[PDB]
C-alpha cells in the first residue's frame, strides 16, 4: 500500500523565493513596489556611509545598493544567513540614519517596511541572538524617538496648532514609532512561536528595563495616549503573559521580572480598561485617558491588523516621487486624508470590541497564570472586573441593546466571558479575599450576581411569535449580515439536509432572545448560583436574602 | 423509525430531568446515578454501517450527545483516574463522529460550537500545564509522508485528517474556547496565527509533494480556509481577514489547475466554486492580491476550446476590470456590455439554482439599503397614506405579521422626516448612535411633536391607540408599536398618553414574560424630557407621585430603577431634593433596596450627603465607609455638625 515518490517537482528554492518576494513587494494600501520605493532613495547629509563591503556613494542609488547587496549576498548565504546578514547591515544603517543632526529619516520607515517583510518572511529556526540584536537595537531606536509617545495630555491654551501643517514628518515618525513597536510585536511573537527550548537565552533584565522605558513612554498617564502604541505596548505585556503561560517552570522568567514592573504594567492596564467605548466620537477628541480615539493622524492597518479604512495606504505611495532617487519624502496634506457611511465606524465598534476582548482576555490569562498568589495579587482584580461587569450590565440594558447595530452581540459575549472570569474566581481564588475588599464593595458584586439572579426566571420562549417579533424590531442589521452570509459566503448556507432548518429557527430564536438583555444561559445562571446560593461568605443568609427572593417571586 | 418511541421518551423525560429545580447545570460530580452506562451507550449505539446513510436521524443521535454532555458538564473532565479526563477519551470517539462530519461541514460547525464543557476542557488542562503528545505524533506521521511511504487508507483517512485539522486551526473564535494556549490573544490576531502559518508552509510543501471527487473536495477546502473565515462586521461589503492566506490559496488553486485533474463530470462543483471565488474577489481592493497569484491565461481557453462554460464569467469580469469606455449600454438585460466580435453568456450561464444566484448577484454589482431592505423583503407620501389604508385593511381581519409589519418602519421614517429639517439613508445618528455622557442630555426637548404634525402618530392613534389590542390582545405586537413610539417620541415631545405609560409600567412590572420589565423604564425619559407643555414643571413630579405611590417589591427593580433614572436625569436642585429622597431610600430601609440604591449611586457616578449626615446625627457607617474608603475624614465636615448639634440636643443628656 506504498505510495510512490514525487521528487519531479520544479522546486522553487527557498532563498530564491525570499529574494523575488522582497524584490517586488507592494504593501497593503500604497501604489508602488517596495524595492523600488527603495530605488528612489539617496542618503545625502551623510556624504559617505559604509559598514561591511557595503559602500554607498554620496548621490548613489540607495535602492540599487540594496539590490546589489541582496544579489551578491545571494550566492553567498543560505536563507537564515541572508536574514541575519541583512538584519545586521540594515541595523547599522538605521542606527546611524538615526544618530545624525541634519539627517532626514525618510528611508528609515520604508526600510522598516523592509524590517517587517523580511523578519516575518520565515521565522522557523531563526535564532534569538539575531532577533534580540534587531530587537534591542530598535527599542533603543525608540528611545532615540522617545520624544513622541509622551507628548502632553492636551493642547494647552498657549500651545498652538498653527503648523507647517505637514503630515509628513508626523506620519514619518508615526510610521517609525508604530512600525517599530510593530517590530517589537512581530519579532517578539516570532520568539513566542519559536521552539520552547530557545527562550530564557534571550530574556534578561535588559528586556525588562528597555521595554520598561518604552512602556512608561507609551501608555501615558500624564500625556496623550496614542491608540496604536497603546495596542502594541499592551500586547507586549501580553507577550510576557505568553511566556508565563508557556514556560512549564515560568517561575524562571517571573523571578526575572520585577514586582515594581508588574505593578507599573497592571496598574496602567487598569488605566486603560476603565476608559470607555463611545462610537459617538471615536473619531474626534474628547475626555482623555478615557477614549481610545484612533484619529486619522494614525489611522491605517498597522503592519498586521487590517483594522479598516487603512486610509493612509496610497498616501504611502505618495511619499516618494516614484520617479527620482530622493532623500526627503513627498508632501501630503495633513487633512485631505480622511458622513458617507459610518459602517466603517461600526467595523471599528467590532474591533474595539476585540480590544476589550483583549482586556478581559489578558486579565483572564494572568488570572490563570497566578495559581499561587503574588504581590500585585491584591483583589482589586475582583473589584474592577466585577465593576466592569456591573457597568456593562446596567448601561448595557439602558443604552446599547435595541439600537439595531450588531455591536451588541460581541458587547454581550464580552461579559458572557467575564462570567467565566468570575466563576474562575469563585472556584479557585476565594482564599485571599480581604474583608477590606468585600465590604468596600458589597455593592457591585451582589449587583453582578443578582443581574443573572433576576434573569433566572427562565420563563420566556413558549413559542416563536414574540421572539421573532423582537427580532424584527432590533435584529435588522444582524440580519443584514445574516442574509449577506447565507446568500453570499458559505458552503453550509445551501442545501440544509432537513435536520437543520429547525436549527435555523431555534438558533435564531435563542440568538434573538439572547439579544434582548434577557434569559442568558442555563450554564450562566447555575454557575453564578453555585457562587451566591453557596453561602461561602455572608452575602446571603435567608434573613436578608428572602427580600430578594420575593423580589424575584420564589 | 425503529427505536423512535425509545428516543421520544428519552428526550421527553430527560428534558424533564433538567435538574432537581430550575437550577440546571449540576456543576459538580453529582453525589439516580445511572448516567455512566447511558454515557457509554449514547456513542456505543451508533457505530453501525447499516444506519449510516441518512442525515436527520443521525443528527438526532448526535444531538443526544449534545444534551447528555451539555447537561452533565461534569462528564468531560471527570478525572478518568489514570491521569486524564473523559474529553480525552472522547477525542478518539468523536473522531469517528467527525469522520462522518468531515463530509457534513454544517454538522461539523455545529459540533464544534456545541462542544463546564469547552471551558472545563481546558480549565484543569491549563492547570495541569495531551497536546504535547498529539503534536509529537503529528510531526511524526507528517514527516513520514513527503517522501512517500504511507498507507493507502491511513493515507486517505489522514489526508482528510490534515484537511480537517487545517479547518480547525482556521475557524473563527467565538466557537472554540480560549482553553488552549495558542489562541490566547485578541484584536483578532493571537498566537497560533504564525505557528499555524509555519504549519501552512509545511502542508503546502508536503501536499505539493503529494479520486477525481477527492480533488474536487481538495480545492473546495483550498477555497474554504479563506472562504468561511470572515469577520464581516459591515453591510453588504464584508471583510476577509488574512491576505497572506488569500494569495496562498490562489497559488495552490494555480498548481491544481496546472496538474489538471480532479475534473469530475455532472458539475456538482467546478462552476459554482470558481464563480463564487472570483465574485467575492472583484470590487475588493485586493486586485493586486489576484494579479500575481493566479491568471488563468491557459485554461481560460475562450477560443471555443475551454464546467468549461463557467471560468468564462470570471474572464468577463476581468474584461469589466479592463473597463475603458468601449463598453456600451445594457441590451440583453445583461451588464452594460462591451464590443463583442466576445460576450459569452447570461448572468446565469450555469444555474443549478445557486450558481445563478452567486453569479447574477456578483455581475449585478458591475452597476457603476437598510431602509430599502424590508421594503423589498415584502415587495413616500403616497407610500405613507397607502400604508395607512392598507393597514386599516390588515387589522380588519386578524393579521399578525404583515399587520405589525409597519411599526419599525414608522419609527425610522419618523427619524428621516425629522432629518429632512429617503434617497440613500438608514440607521441614524441621534436615533441610533451612543455618545459619552447622558443619552438624555443628548436628546433635544424643544423639537417637534406628534399630534397631527406627525401623520405617523396620526395613523398611530388611528390604528393602535383606541383599539381592543390595548385592552386584552397583541401580547408583544402592542409592545413593538411601543418601541415605535419609543423612537417616535425620542424624536418628538409628546402630550399627556401617559395613561398608556402608567398601566404600562405596572404591566411591565408583573409582565408575565420578563420582556416588558424595564421596557417602560426605557420609555419614561422620553416623557420626562419635555417642553411645550410642562417642560420641567410638575409633570415629572406628577409621574413621581404615581411612582412612589407604587411600593411593591414584587418586580421591585421596575419600581425602583426607573424611579431613580427619572429624578437622576432631571436637572438641578430639583433632582437635588430628589437625591435627598433617594439617599433617604438608601438611609436605613429595606436592606434589599438601600444597598441597591448605593449600587446605582455608584452607577450614576459611573455614567446631599452633608445635609443628611448632619440631619441623622442631630436626630440620633456603611455609606461613608464605602464613599471615602474610611470614615475618619468626617472631621472635615464636622463643622456644621458639632457646633449646631450634638450639644444643644438634650442639654444635659446628649
Residue numbers in the entry:
A (entry chain D): 189 to 526, 532 to 747
B (entry chain F): 2 to 32, 44 to 127, 133 to 146, 149 to 229, 236 to 331, 339 to 373, 375 to 401, 412 to 422, ...
From the paper:
In short, our study reveals a novel gating mechanism by which kinase N-lobe toggles between two alternative docking sites and recurrently commits the Mec1/ATR kinase for substrate recruitment, confined catalysis and product release.
About 30% particles are classified into another conformation with a global resolution of 4.5 angstroms. The overall height has been reduced from 170 Å (HU-Dimer1) to 160 Å (HU-Dimer2). PRD moves about 10 angstroms outward and downward (away from the activation loop), LBE moves about 8 angstroms inward, and the activation loop has room to move outward. The subtle conformational changes of TRD3 make space and enables the motion of PRD. Globally, the conformational changes of Mec1-Ddc2 activated by HU treatment, which are confined in the FATKIN (FAT-Kinase domains) region, are not significant. The Mec1 activation induced by HU treatment involves the same mechanistic step as the constitutive active Mec1(F2244L) mutant, with relocation of PRD, FATC, and LBE is coupled to subtle conformational changes in FAT and N-lobe.
